[PDB]
Amino acid sequence: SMEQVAMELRLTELTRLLRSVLDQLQDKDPARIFAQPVSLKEVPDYLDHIKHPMDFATMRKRLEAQGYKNLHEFEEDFDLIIDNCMKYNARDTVFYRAAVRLRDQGGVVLRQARREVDSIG
């Protein structure tokens, strides 16, 4: 149908907007602390602590399969990245502190993305 195509055009433009958001969020992690999944070889107990691991490469695979239906779903993933880190790592660690900074800096990007998604439909 013609509707299914128009739908797919919007999903595709949402994907396009989310890719730009993702790149902007990821620039706020220049240390690449959140770039890849936590290694289960190097942190073998991790899944006893953290039930839903997340990271930027994993978000990017979902993104490119058009797996995000709306901004809310994408934000849930970003928030997992931060929240997981803030639980597993203690307050005085470079990792916790990197998550605080990514949260604070991404807030601005996410604020605008929500306006752009509402605005453009």
UniProtKB/Swiss-Prot annotation:
Cross-link Glycyl lysine isopeptide (Lys-Gly) (interchain with G-Cter in SUMO2), sequence positions: K41
Entry's localization field: Nucleus; Chromosome
Residues covered by the Bromo domain: 9-113
Tissue expression notes: Highly expressed in testis.
Self-association and partners: Component of some HBO1 complex composed of KAT7/HBO1, MEAF6, ING4 and BRD1/BRPF2. Component of the MOZ/MORF complex composed at least of ING5, KAT6A, KAT6B, MEAF6 and one of BRPF1, BRD1/BRPF2 and BRPF3. Interacts (via PHD-type zinc finger domain) with unmodified histone H3. Interacts (via PWWP domain) with dimethylated and trimethylated 'Lys-79' on histone H3.
Its biological purpose: Scaffold subunit of various histone acetyltransferase (HAT) complexes, such as the MOZ/MORF and HBO1 complexes, that acts as a regulator of hematopoiesis. Plays a key role in HBO1 complex by directing KAT7/HBO1 specificity towards histone H3 'Lys-14' acetylation (H3K14ac), thereby promoting erythroid differentiation.
Name of this chain's protein: Bromodomain-containing protein 1
UniProt lineage: Eukaryota, Metazoa, Chordata, Craniata, Vertebrata
